[PDB]
């Protein structure tokens, strides 16, 4: 394999031969790929439209360079709640709030991500604004999972060899195939999750990769360029369990939710988003809570899928009830406090 | 305008707004584009499929940064003879350029040393003893005294060095490969210009059409970036701001059908031996292709001043090209060009 060969195939709009994507990723991860080669690859792969096989190769090689969590420290049934990024849409870290709620409902959660580059606060930035310690080594993430029921893998710490690709992604700005990898390279390797994607075609490819891994995942596409479930719109969901995939329409009105406007979900700076977290966890009603409950419920449905396959509608009713009770019992607010307490104990 | 805005538009498969390709090219030419931005732009532009207006902005900005030849040193009727690459036909276009100049038409070529074993334009000329790296004043004297000149890309396009490095690193052909024939620093107004892809040949013809130009953009229907003898070719004939696209068959001029492995070029040394053989009068498919393409350049040239029609222009171009070889004019002119570089 070589760059000319691989880039040539992609510019002719052809799928790669098995192994070519892996070779490309290994060049990137070992520091052997020039920034121009990284950029040409990311763009050409994006414009061709990556296959599930190709994305599985990228993710599997990236994972092989990542720091693992210590053996046996990740619960067998841990989940992720994450999106690949909104399409010119920035909500108030709904996936961060849903993660807390899911963990409060008794489902272990391991998130994975980075600080945002701008003053639009990312989930990690909002967590630090709440007092959470986000940059911890494998041993401490595993202890947080044990003692609290939630953990956070700081990407630069677990994927140090990804720095060359990270620099290039910042320089070109546009979304590429690399935007898909975050959910598929969680170093805790959860086997279930609710995974959002702002593009239907890519959502489907991601579902194919989770199917290949025999994960139990709901991959969600908000019919409006949202990479999460929302009461703003209907959504499409790929229900992935047992190597197999059902594509379903999802209308939250069907569960009694009122339609909300997208601007009611808008994020701001870290301090503002921290305030929104506290409000939802304190039991505040409105479209922010509704979206949190929806996403947490979908993660809980995905978790259930590891161990059986229940009817869709009753699985959701029970997921929505568990998410609501987690908030209204005070469990989600108490779980965030326990998480903060844990971080403060480290010193 | 910014890289995320422009790259995003291209990845969304949209044509750019007027001025955006120009902004991108200017960033690249001024040393302000990061290598990753240059590569992303080259690739995204290629996969979207560049329009004539976009390519015109790229070429026009690149030309704005180039060194010109001195005032009144390029005859108004100078021609280029070149292809954009496949494989390649540097063997053919080198030989045809010499033949065309030996027929009495001023020729000005433009190119670089390649990195690969596959010869660049400059490399074949070098293997023939031609001195390729001359400044504007000596290129002008070459044109006046020999009837042919060569503009060494790194000397006339110093600000392109950032783009050239990126191009070498990624290897894959991009829209940048189309720009060579459109950024000849001598700005010749006529040419026979080959392209290996029919869709991009048409885009190139559209760019020449917007100039004051008489050009045959040519595409062998076997993929050759040159008029082929293997089968028909498509020609976009450009004159007076318009394009006339046609199917051309050199069988109508008595050219026998060749096979494709017979026409392709090799390394500088293999090319140089082919040049010596053909200019000495060796007959066969390589000669035939050289004569075919030289005649096409002669026809484009005649389009500048002459009212001669298509078929009689071709018959005369063919007679002139064959005679330039057979009377030893081409051999003599190459010798003269070699003497000129030694006598500096």
UniProtKB/Swiss-Prot annotation, chain B:
Signal peptide: none annotated. Keywords: Amino-acid biosynthesis, Aromatic amino acid biosynthesis, Glycosyltransferase, Magnesium, Metal-binding, Transferase, Tryptophan biosynthesis. Binds 2 magnesium ions per monomer. Anthranilate 1 binds at residues 83, 112. It comes from the Bacteria. One of its GO terms (biological process) is L-tryptophan biosynthetic process. Pfam families: Glycos_trans_3N (PF02885), Glycos_transf_3 (PF00591). Mg(2+) 2 binds at residues 225-226. 5-phospho-alpha-D-ribose 1-diphosphate binds at residues 83, 89, 91-94, 109-117, 121. Its EC number is 2.4.2.18. GO terms for molecular function: anthranilate phosphoribosyltransferase activity; magnesium ion binding. Its cofactor is Mg(2+). Anthranilate 2 binds at residue 167. It catalyses: N-(5-phospho-beta-D-ribosyl)anthranilate + diphosphate = 5-phospho-alpha-D-ribose 1-diphosphate + anthranilate. Mg(2+) 1 binds at residues 93, 226. GO terms for cellular component: cytosol. HAMAP family: TrpD. Belongs to the anthranilate phosphoribosyltransferase family. Catalyzes the transfer of the phosphoribosyl group of 5-phosphorylribose-1-pyrophosphate (PRPP) to anthranilate to yield N-(5'-phosphoribosyl)-anthranilate (PRA). Homodimer. This is Anthranilate phosphoribosyltransferase. The lineage of its organism: Bacteria, Bacillati, Actinomycetota, Actinomycetes, Mycobacteriales.
């Amino acid at each position: 394999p070589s760059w000319p060969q691989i880039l040539g195939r992609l510019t002719d709009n052809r799928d790669l031969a098995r192994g070519q994507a892996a070779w490309a990723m290994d060049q990137i991860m070992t520091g052997n790929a020039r920034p121009a080669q990284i950029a040409a690859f990311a763009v050409a792969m994006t414009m061709k439209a990556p296959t599930a096989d190709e994305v599985g190769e990228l993710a599997g090689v990236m994972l092989s360079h990542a720091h693992p969590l210590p053996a046996d420290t990740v619960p067998d049934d841990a989940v992720d709640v994450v999106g690949t990024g909104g399409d010119g849409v920035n909500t108030v870290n709904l996936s961060t709030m849903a993660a807390i709620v899911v963990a409060a409902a008794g489902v272990p959660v391991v998130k994975h991500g980075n600080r945002a580059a701008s003053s639009l606060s990312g989930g990690a930035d909002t967590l630090e604004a709440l007092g959470v310690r986000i940059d911890l080594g494998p041993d401490l993430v595993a202890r947080s999972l044990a003692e609290v029921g939630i953990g956070f893998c700081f990407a630069p710490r677990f994927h140090p060899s990804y720095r060359h690709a990270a620099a290039v992604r910042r320089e070109i700005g546009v979304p590429t195939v690399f935007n898909l990898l975050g959910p598929l390279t969680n170093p805790a390797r959860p086997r279930a999750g609710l995974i959002g994607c702002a593009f239907a075609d890519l959502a489907e490819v991601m579902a194919g990769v989770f199917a290949a891994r025999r994960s139990s995942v709901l991959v969600v596409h908000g019919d409006d360029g949202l990479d999460e479930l929302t009461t703003t719109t209907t959504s499409t969901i790929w229900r992935v369990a047992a190597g197999s995939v059902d594509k379903l329409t999802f209308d939250p009105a069907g569960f009694g939710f009122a339609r909300a406007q997208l601007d009611q979900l808008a994020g701001g700076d870290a301090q503002a988003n921290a305030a929104a977290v506290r409000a939802v966890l304190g039991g505040a009603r409105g479209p922010v809570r509704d979206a949190v409950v929806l996403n947490a419920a979908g993660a809980i449905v995905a978790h259930a899928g590891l161990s059986s396959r229940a009817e869709w509608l009753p699985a959701w009713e029970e997921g929505l009830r568990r998410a609501s009770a987690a908030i209204d019992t005070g469990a989600a607010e108490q779980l965030l406090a326990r998480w903060v307490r844990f971080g403060r104990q480290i010193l």
